[PDB]
Structure 1
């Protein structure tokens, strides 16, 4: 399952005639595109590898 979430503030005069506004005209734009399932877990680092990436000398 994939989730696309959007939030922001829109000026009414930036909305086009077809009730559309580009995402670059939204003030506090919060855009999120995430997923779950084993596909999403396959894109997470292992805990040991994350620990090393954060605490290894090099």
Structure 2
């Protein structure tokens, strides 16, 4: 996560909601052979971009 926040939006327990973050970049993903199963590869990508 990266972004810009206001100190006024930080609650009493030092927590801020994610929708209060300006220029937010949120990335939740995996890595390795586990992530290899989530993508189709070249074969299906060509078929999907052609049809």
Give structure 1 stretches of 5+ with no counterpart.
1-5
Residues 1-58 of structure 1 correspond to what in structure 2 (within 5 A)? 6-56=1-51
- What is the number of equivalent residue pairs in this alignment? 51
Give structure 2 stretches of 5+ with no counterpart.
none
Which 4+ runs in 1 deviate beyond 2 A?
none
Greater RCO structure (CA 8 Å; 6+ sep): 1
Distance 2:41 2:9 in 1: 45
Kindly indicate which of the two structures has a greater share of residues assigned to helix. Answer: 2
* RMSD of aligned alpha carbons: 0.9
